[PDB]
């Protein structure tokens, strides 16, 4: 909770400290007035208790002022309460915004392993729950607990000074009883609510499972059994809600019984004190009204405490996400790439594996030269979908040297590297947003003319104008769903916008159509063919790897051989030959079977 | 709303009428006491306002009784309120149960078209919303509206008889003002809450779309843009909640201002009436306390009215689902099948189509003889997945005669028919329940020994004992997910339990493995081969249709020819030949390509 008091009382920002002190003053004055009200009511009652001789005179001003003060005190108490609410909301929402944004800025900075291990739904639920918890905690600790505590103290002091300690004793005892009673009975009612929600979700699941499969529900005549299961679940839910209502009745009745006993006993004490000439009827009114005022705001407090501990747990969970440490950090003396010459990714004595038990890439030592569209190939598990993650600095090498331009990779700024490293991923994503925004994603700092030029260069205009809304469609799960080729050309356009020196085509064409694959390859070779773009195809369908100036083969996480397609295909025993023959026969059978299918 | 007053005041059930009258009596007495309380307080104040001469006497009993009556009246008012709540809950939940069950009993009785047109999520949401609406309507119309109306009337009568009409005028005017103010300001606050929820869902969607695609968020360095979108959405949400809190402050402050003006003006009227020797200070107390009691329960009522109209709309929607009419009804003079001889499904001059525009099955006239495992075959759209729906009486024939045993189908009881008509559907369903229950589904009135015998006959025991929990696994979407063959043998076991005379295998093997298909066929031919089970295979893979005694071919929704496999395959020009050759070459290429794949 300390970090919370750090987000609402920081070091340096005076605006927030002042807003908080103002909320404090408003709270204090609100309670002062809520307690002064009865005193004006009593001064009224004790100024009217005279023997009026002339029943035609006007109301003296000494009493009109008292009545007016009574009214303005009521109004001012409630008003200051609500103003405190408004102000401290202005504060708590700033705190929530700040913490959520700092957390999200961290997550975008952690390593990848910490994201692949953990679940995303869990992270989002944690953020939401911790935020609601901060809100509820500040609420219940400024709106319901601190004010009522101040009021109880003021009331006990009033009743101890004016009349005696007996009233303060009775009031504090009543408060203790009310509190513990409410807490325990609320636990009880929570058990009942849990049971009810369970038995309602059950019935809903049954109704669903029965209406979706109506055909099978009727193919066997089993509709009465379903109605009976539904009746049983509904009866359980009925009984549970019955018990919930009865328990709420017990709760409210017991609370009112407690406060009624307090008020009645205090009326008796005041009525036996009046006999001693000490007090006056106005004092009975004062006591009853003070205690009832104490009673008014206690329902809410007794309710909220139920939720405070879960909210504190959620807050701790959330605040924990920013305590995690980053392993991939900008090593000392960050630099900037030469950014004036071609680039290389020469490896040296590399050894890397996700989990330290099963190494995937072993003693690899190869060379990605300058301006030569190298091609990696192997098996899924032979360490070819990992070169990217290892050059993009998502992980580090275990006793390995990722040498770029004769200089290690752990010496540059991770961002100065990731900014000149572009990728065409296998299954590109699409945010729940437009298609113009998802393509601006490549370089937000772009002019719309550049965006349209690249969208046309990627052969996408025929597919964007074909849609209902021009450049404003809604893509993603929560919207339109386009197929593979479109997504791949979209990712290609993103890359075109990035305009990087080194490109990694991570299986751009994994599961698509033959002619769509050929179109993608044609576009890629028409755009990414200059002699100033180090290209690297992480491919497993050699049908596309024919023009590369260096083909690297990885078996059992080790480099085997190099050379051009025709060069090594003619070499005895090379895996290139077996793989090529297998893929060729596979494509033969594939296209033949597809022709047969479209026949049928 | 009338039907509601029919479900809580039926004709014949005296228990419910009596429970309701008791709730009524409790409500009335609760308000009587909540209004008598101040009179005891005033009798107290006006009995203590004496000149006590001996300040050592005890409290007379004439005042102790008054104080005790005051306390028991408070407690009894609240107690009767809560008892009314409990009782009318005991009633409303019975009503909810009854209406939900009757609705679900109807849906299981409607035709199929009404289910295929409409959406299931919509039906379930409608049921849930209408149920919550019934609950909320009864609540707000027995707990918040009727009681406060009775109390306002009683208060106006009291203040009109005892003192004068001015107080009743002020009180009723105050109530009008409070009501309309609360309504309008609540509409306002609802607008603000809508905006806030929108801008929070937006931010959550952004966080999701950014954490799921973290790889692509980093492959382009676009994390600051994401943080900025998040900051913008969070700022909108912040401002919206600020305005919500300020508006709630305005609301509560205005309400308290209204009631404060009422109380203060009434104190002034009472204090200028006391001058006329008419009233006494106790009357000022009486007035203030009565009006404050009126004020206490009004927040809730002012809130709920927001939700009452949507709830009435939901109730009407729900109650509408039982007004729909059934077209497939048990025609006059329902009968029972002979149930002592083999069965036939001889058609005659049939003509049927889902939508009257595009007929699918035209002038069909064929014969499904007794004990002959007939086989239908054609194209998906040639009218072969419809013979079932038309013999199972999910639809009716347009100028067609579905003759069974020389007698029409519209003459028997739909259930006496559906009970001797079993089906093995293509994609069988699985409820979110066990595997022993989903197999008991076939015949709930079965002995566990029969269930296990058939589960073994279906060659399923190897697949039920292979799982963690024996006969108690959790299947379905919300649980374990088994593959095709298991589901098909499960549906087969269901049928085995039904033990019907006529069976329809509706593409039992559509998309499975070769050996799994052969195993399913072997099981089916081992079980369903007796000479007393009219079998009908609605199949499109003739590789299984070789042993049937009658193969029917449907082209363009018309019967073409008949005969045994070898009989018509040797016939010139028969579609059987083309289809057989195509499927054979297709299976050849399929298995060859699969061998090639498992090579690679
Ligand atoms: C999180 C926990 C924090 C706990 C902090 C609680 C501290 C409060 C403790 C004790 C306060 C009790 C003081 C009451 C003494 C009684 C004085 C009194 O009776 O005066 C009342 C009105 O005062 C009034 O209106 C009573 C209100 C006066 C209270 C002022 C103290 C607050 C100052 C701010 C403290 C941060 C009027 O009485 P009268 O008949 O008009 O004349 C009597 C003499 N003038
Ligand atoms: C959905 C809308 C339905 C609207 C129906 C509302 C009908 C109510 C209309 C008028 C009722 C006003 C009657 C009050 C007359 C005043 C009588 C009165 O002052 O008696 C009060 C207590 O009575 C009391 O405690 C006051 C409560 C008595 C009320 C009894 C009437 C209810 C009967 C049930 C009706 C269904 C005590 O006054 P006291 O000083 O002790 O002596 C005066 C004479 N005994």
Closest CA to A159 of A262, A276, A27: A262
CATH topology of domain A1-321: ABC transporter transmembrane region fold (1.20.1560)
Q: Which CATH code, of 1.10.10.410, 1.20.1630.10, 3.40.50.300, 3.40.980.10, is assigned to A347-599?
A: 3.40.50.300
On whether A378 is known to bind a ligand per the annotation, the reply is yes
Instruction: Find tokens 């190298």 and name the residue.
Output: A374
Strands (E), A412-466: 421-424
Q: Give the C-alpha separation, B377 to A66, whole Å.
A: 97
Contact criterion met (CB below 8 Å) for B544 and B524: no
DSSP character string of B277-335: TS--HHHHHHHHHHHHHHHTTHHHHHHHHHHHHHHHHHHHHHHHTTTS--SS---SS--
Closest CA to B69 of A300, A131, A267: A267
Measured in degrees and rounded to the nearest 5, phi and psi for residue B271 equal -75, -25
Per the structure block, which two tokens stand in for B194?
């809508």
For A85, the closest of B112, B249, B428 (CB atoms) is B249
Q: Give the C-alpha separation, A554 to A376, whole Å.
A: 7
Q: For every residue of A500-566, which 3-state class applies, written as one string?
A: CCEEEEECCCCCCCHHHHHHHHHHHHHHCCCCCCEEEEECCCHHHCCCCCCEEEEECCEECCCCCHH
| Cα A578–Cα A582–Cα A584 angle in degrees, nearest 5 | 120
Q: Give the C-alpha separation, A365 to A347, whole Å.
A: 5
Cross-strand bridge partners of residue A364: A350
Label residue B371 left, alpha or beta by phi (over 0 means left) and psi (-120 to 50 means alpha).
left
Asked if A116 has any chain B CB less than 8 Å from its own CB, the reply is no
On whether B383 is known to bind a ligand per the annotation, the reply is yes
- Find all residues with CB under 8 Å of A492, minimum gap 6, and list them: A424, A458, A508, A520, A523, A524, A527
Contact criterion met (CB below 8 Å) for A395 and A352: yes
Per the structure block, which two tokens stand in for A545?
């790897």
Terminal C-alpha separation, chain B: 69
Distance A36 CA to ligand 1 centre (A): 9
Rounded-to-10 torsion of CA A100, A103, A104, A106? 160
Residue A529 CA: distances (Å) to CA of A29, A92, A158, A304: 76, 55, 88, 66
Q: Give the C-alpha separation, A283 to A286, whole Å.
A: 5
The HSE-up count of residue A151 (CA atoms within 13 Å, CB side) is: 27
Test the B interface: residue of A97, A106, A389, A431 with most B CBs within 10 Å: A431
Q: Give the C-alpha separation, A232 to A554, whole Å.
A: 62
CB atoms near residue B138 (< 10 Å): 21
Cross-strand bridge partners of residue A422: A503
- What stretch of H or E contains A348? strand A347-348
Q: Give the C-alpha separation, A357 to B313, whole Å.
A: 62
CB atoms near residue A539 (< 10 Å): 21
Helices (H) and strands (E) in chain B, counts: 20, 10
Q: Do A74 and B261 touch (CB under 8 A)?
A: no
Q: Give the C-alpha separation, A348 to A403, whole Å.
A: 7
Closest CA to B425 of B513, B517, B492: B492
Q: Do A57 and B275 touch (CB under 8 A)?
A: yes
Asked if A600 has any chain B CB less than 8 Å from its own CB, the reply is yes
On whether B106 is known to bind a ligand per the annotation, the reply is no
Instruction: Find tokens 């002062």 and name the residue.
Output: A32
Report the chain B residue with the minimal C-alpha distance to residue A281. Answer: B45
According to DSSP, residue A404 is labeled B
Task: Indicate the SS3 state at residue B537.
Answer: strand
b or e along B18-57 (b: 16 or more beta carbons within 10 Å of the residue's beta carbon)?
ebbeebeebbbbbbbbbbbbbbbbbbbbbbbeeeeeeeee
Kindly give the residue spans of alpha helices, DSSP state H, lying in A108-144: 113-117, 120-139
Kindly give the residue spans of alpha helices, DSSP state H, lying in A402-513: 414-418, 436-440, 448-457, 461-464, 484-498
Residue B295 CA: distances (Å) to CA of A248, B159, B160, B298, B302: 22, 16, 19, 6, 11
Closest CA to A198 of A244, A266, A256, A132: A244
Task: Indicate the SS3 state at residue A441.
Answer: coil
Expressed in Å, this structure's resolution amounts to 3.3
- What stretch of H or E contains A231? helix A224-273
Q: Give the C-alpha separation, A574 to A559, whole Å.
A: 13
Q: Give the C-alpha separation, A339 to B404, whole Å.
A: 85
Instruction: Find tokens 């036996």 and name the residue.
Output: A272
- What stretch of H or E contains B554? strand B551-555
Q: What share of chain B is helix, strand, coil (3-state, %, to 5)?
A: 60, 5, 30
Q: Give the C-alpha separation, A213 to A203, whole Å.
A: 16
Q: Give the C-alpha separation, B8 to B596, whole Å.
A: 71
Q: Give the C-alpha separation, A193 to A157, whole Å.
A: 40
Label residue A556 left, alpha or beta by phi (over 0 means left) and psi (-120 to 50 means alpha).
left
B432: burial class by Cβ within 10 Å (0-12, 13-18, 19+)? middle
Closest CA to B428 of B415, B446, B441: B441
| Cα B318–Cα B21–Cα B296 angle in degrees, nearest 5 | 80
On whether B320 is known to bind a ligand per the annotation, the reply is no
| Residue extents of the structural domains in chain B | 1-321, 347-599
Contact criterion met (CB below 8 Å) for A568 and A552: no
Per the structure block, which two tokens stand in for A439?
């393509």
Closest CA to B443 of B495, B498, B492: B498
Instruction: Find tokens 């100065």 and name the residue.
Output: A416
DSSP character string of B558-598: EE-----HHHHHTSTT-HHHHHHHHHHHHHHHHHHHHHHHH
Label residue B499 left, alpha or beta by phi (over 0 means left) and psi (-120 to 50 means alpha).
left
Contact criterion met (CB below 8 Å) for A221 and B415: yes
Of all protein residues, the one whose alpha carbon is nearest to atom 1 of ligand 1 is A146
Q: Give the C-alpha separation, B298 to B462, whole Å.
A: 66
Per the structure block, which two tokens stand in for A381?
């598990």
Of all protein residues, the one whose alpha carbon is nearest to atom 4 of ligand 2 is B150
Q: Give the C-alpha separation, B498 to B297, whole Å.
A: 60
Instruction: Find tokens 């692949």 and name the residue.
Output: A116
- Find all residues with CB under 8 Å of B434, minimum gap 6, and list them: B471, B472, B473, B474, B475
Report how far Cα A229 is from the mean position of its chain's Cα atoms: 38
On whether A383 is known to bind a ligand per the annotation, the reply is yes
Test the A interface: residue of B63, B66, B275, B289 with most A CBs within 10 Å: B275
- What stretch of H or E contains B214? helix B214-219
For B124, the closest of A207, A284, A599 (CB atoms) is A207
Instruction: Find tokens 């779309």 and name the residue.
Output: B209
Contact criterion met (CB below 8 Å) for A275 and B55: yes
Contact criterion met (CB below 8 Å) for A497 and A439: yes
Give the strand pairing for B350-352 and B361-364.
Answer: antiparallel
According to DSSP, residue A407 is labeled B
Contact criterion met (CB below 8 Å) for A290 and A159: yes
Chain B partners of A241 at a C-beta cutoff of 8 Å?
A: 89, 93
Radius of gyration (C-alpha) of chain B in whole angstroms: 38
In angstroms, what separates the C-alpha of B488 from chain A's closest C-alpha?
13
Instruction: Find tokens 């009565």 and name the residue.
Output: B290
Q: Give the C-alpha separation, B384 to B554, whole Å.
A: 7
Q: Give the C-alpha separation, B152 to A239, whole Å.
A: 34
Contact criterion met (CB below 8 Å) for A302 and A176: no
Per the structure block, which two tokens stand in for B349?
């001059």
Q: Give the C-alpha separation, A526 to B23, whole Å.
A: 83
Cross-strand bridge partners of residue B536: B374, B504
Contact criterion met (CB below 8 Å) for A67 and A100: no
Per the structure block, which two tokens stand in for A462?
């025929």
Contact criterion met (CB below 8 Å) for A326 and A109: yes
According to DSSP, residue A475 is labeled B
Cross-strand bridge partners of residue A535: A503
Of all protein residues, the one whose alpha carbon is nearest to atom 22 of ligand 2 is B36
Closest CA to A38 of A293, A368, A413, A258: A293
Q: Give the C-alpha separation, A100 to A303, whole Å.
A: 27
Of all protein residues, the one whose alpha carbon is nearest to atom 16 of ligand 2 is B158
Cross-strand bridge partners of residue B537: B375, B505
Closest CA to B152 of B183, B181, B176: B176
Sign of CA dihedral B222, B223, B224, B229: positive
Asked if B380 has any chain A CB less than 8 Å from its own CB, the reply is no
Instruction: Find tokens 């009217």 and name the residue.
Output: A48
Q: Give the C-alpha separation, A262 to A242, whole Å.
A: 30
The HSE-up count of residue A244 (CA atoms within 13 Å, CB side) is: 16
Q: Give the C-alpha separation, B29 to B24, whole Å.
A: 9
Task: Indicate the SS3 state at residue B460.
Answer: coil
On whether A311 is known to bind a ligand per the annotation, the reply is no
According to DSSP, residue A486 is labeled H
Give the strand pairing for B534-538 and B374-377.
Answer: parallel
Q: Give the C-alpha separation, A577 to B170, whole Å.
A: 100
Contact criterion met (CB below 8 Å) for A277 and B52: yes
Q: Which residues line ligand 2 (CB under 6 A)?
A: B 28, 32, 35-36, 39, 146, 149-150, 153-154, 157-158, 161-162
| Cα A198–Cα A202–Cα A206 angle in degrees, nearest 5 | 175
Sign of CA dihedral A287, A291, A292, A297: positive
Contact criterion met (CB below 8 Å) for B402 and B361: no
| N residues, chain A | 600
Q: Give the C-alpha separation, A451 to A374, whole Å.
A: 28
In angstroms, what separates the C-alpha of A440 from chain B's closest C-alpha?
10
Q: Give the C-alpha separation, A144 to B549, whole Å.
A: 83
Q: Give the C-alpha separation, B411 to B502, whole Å.
A: 18
Q: What is the largest CA-CA distance in chain A?
A: 131
Contact criterion met (CB below 8 Å) for A84 and A142: yes
Per the structure block, which two tokens stand in for A184?
């325990």
Per the structure block, which two tokens stand in for A200?
């309602």
- What stretch of H or E contains B502? strand B502-506
Measured in degrees and rounded to the nearest 5, phi and psi for residue A117 equal -65, -50
Ligand 2 pocket, mutate which of B150, B152, B279 (most atoms under 8 A from CB): B150
Q: Give the C-alpha separation, A545 to A552, whole Å.
A: 11
Contact criterion met (CB below 8 Å) for A202 and A233: yes
Residue B33 CA: distances (Å) to CA of B28, B162, B205: 9, 17, 54
Sign of CA dihedral B86, B87, B91, B92: negative
The HSE-up count of residue B316 (CA atoms within 13 Å, CB side) is: 6
Q: Which atom of ligand 2 is nearest to the CA of B28?
A: 34
Q: Give the C-alpha separation, A579 to B522, whole Å.
A: 39
Task: Indicate the SS3 state at residue B125.
Answer: helix
Closest CA to B382 of B528, B547, B575: B575
Q: Which atom of ligand 1 is nearest to the CA of A31?
A: 27
CB atoms near residue B114 (< 10 Å): 14
Taking a contact as any Cβ pair under 8 Å apart, which residues of chain A between 542 and 571 contact chain B? none
- What stretch of H or E contains B23? helix B14-48
Contact criterion met (CB below 8 Å) for A96 and A128: no
CB atoms near residue B300 (< 10 Å): 14
Closest CA to A37 of A9, A1, A66, A6: A66
- What stretch of H or E contains B247? helix B224-273
Chain B partners of A210 at a C-beta cutoff of 8 Å?
A: 104, 108, 431
Instruction: Find tokens 């001469």 and name the residue.
Output: B53
Distance A253 CA to ligand 2 centre (A): 25
Chain B partners of A586 at a C-beta cutoff of 8 Å?
A: 593, 596-597, 600
Q: For every residue of A71-103, which 3-state class applies, written as one string?
A: HHHHHHHHHHHHHHHHHHHHHHHHHHHHHHHHH
Q: Which atom of ligand 1 is nearest to the CA of A161?
A: 16
Contact criterion met (CB below 8 Å) for A196 and A244: yes
Contact criterion met (CB below 8 Å) for B314 and B130: yes
Strands (E), B332-452: 347-348, 350-352, 361-364, 374-377, 401-402, 421-424
Closest CA to A384 of A507, A277, A483: A507
């Amino acid at each position: 909770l300390k970090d919370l008091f750090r987000y609402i009382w920081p070091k340096g920002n005076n605006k927030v400290r002042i807003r908080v002190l103002i909320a404090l003053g408003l709270l204090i004055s609100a309670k002062i007035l809520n307690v002064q009200v009865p005193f004006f009511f009593k001064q009224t009652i004790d100024s009217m208790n005279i023997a009026w001789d002339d029943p035609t005179v006007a109301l003296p001003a000494a009493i009109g002022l008292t009545i007016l003060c009574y009214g303005v005190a009521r109004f001012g108490s409630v008003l200051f309460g609500e103003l405190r609410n408004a102000v401290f909301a202005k504060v708590a929402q700033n705190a929530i915004r700040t913490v959520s944004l700092q957390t999200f800025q961290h997550l975008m900075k952690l390593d990848l392993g910490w994201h692949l291990s953990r679940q995303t739904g869990g992270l989002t639920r944690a953020m939401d729950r911790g935020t609601k918890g901060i809100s509820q905690v500040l609420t219940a600790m400024v709106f319901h607990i601190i004010p009522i505590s101040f009021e109880i103290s003021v009331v006990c002091g009033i009743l101890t000074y004016q009349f005696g300690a007996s009233f303060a004793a009775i009031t504090f005892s009543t408060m203790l009883l009310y509190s513990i009673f409410t807490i325990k009975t609320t636990a009880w009612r929570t058990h009942f609510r849990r049971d009810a929600n369970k038995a309602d979700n059950k019935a809903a699941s049954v109704a669903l499972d029965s209406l979706i499969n109506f055909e099978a529900v009727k193919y066997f005549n089993n509709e009465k059994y379903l109605a009976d299961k539904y009746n049983g679940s509904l009866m359980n839910y009925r009984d549970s809600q019955i018990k919930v209502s009865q328990s709420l009745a017990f709760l409210n009745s017991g609370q009112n019984l407690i406060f009624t006993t307090a008020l009645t006993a205090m009326m008796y004490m005041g009525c036996t004190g009046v006999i001693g000439g000490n007090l006056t009827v106005g004092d009975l009114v004062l006591i009853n009204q003070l205690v009832f005022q104490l009673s008014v705001p206690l329902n809410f407090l007794g309710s909220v405490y139920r939720d405070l501990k879960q909210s504190l747990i959620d807050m701790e969970t959330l605040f924990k996400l920013r305590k995690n440490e980053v392993k991939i950090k900008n090593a000392e003396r960050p630099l900037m790439l030469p950014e004036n010459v071609p680039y290389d990714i020469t490896f040296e004595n590399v050894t890397f594996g996700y989990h330290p038990d099963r190494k995937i890439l072993k003693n690899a030592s190869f060379t990605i030269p300058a301006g030569w569209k190298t091609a990696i190939v192997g098996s899924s598990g032979s360490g070819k979908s990992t070169i990217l993650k290892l050059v993009f600095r998502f992980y580090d090498p275990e006793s390995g040297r990722i040498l770029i331009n004769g200089r290690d990779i752990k010496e540059y700024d991770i961002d100065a590297l990731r900014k000149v490293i572009g990728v065409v991923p296998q299954d590109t994503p699409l945010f729940n947003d437009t298609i113009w925004e998802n393509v601006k994603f490549g370089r937000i700092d772009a002019t719309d003319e550049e965006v349209i030029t690249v969208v046309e260069k990627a052969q996408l205009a025929p597919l964007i104008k074909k849609l209902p809304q021009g450049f404003d469609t809604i893509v993603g799960e929560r919207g339109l769903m386009i197929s593979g080729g479109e997504k791949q050309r979209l990712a290609i356009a993103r890359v075109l916008l990035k305009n990087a020196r080194i490109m990694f085509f991570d299986e751009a064409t994994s599961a698509l159509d033959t002619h769509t694959e050929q179109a993608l390859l044609r576009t890629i070779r028409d755009n990414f063919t200059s002699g100033s773009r180090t290209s690297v195809y992480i491919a497993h369908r050699l049908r596309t790897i024919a023009d590369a100036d260096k083909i690297i083969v990885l078996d059992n996480g080790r480099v085997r051989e190099e050379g051009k397609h025709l060069e090594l295909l003619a070499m005895p025993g090379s895996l290139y030959r077996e793989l090529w023959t297998i893929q060729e026969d596979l494509d033969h059978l594939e296209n033949e079977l597809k022709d047969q299918q479209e026949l049928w």
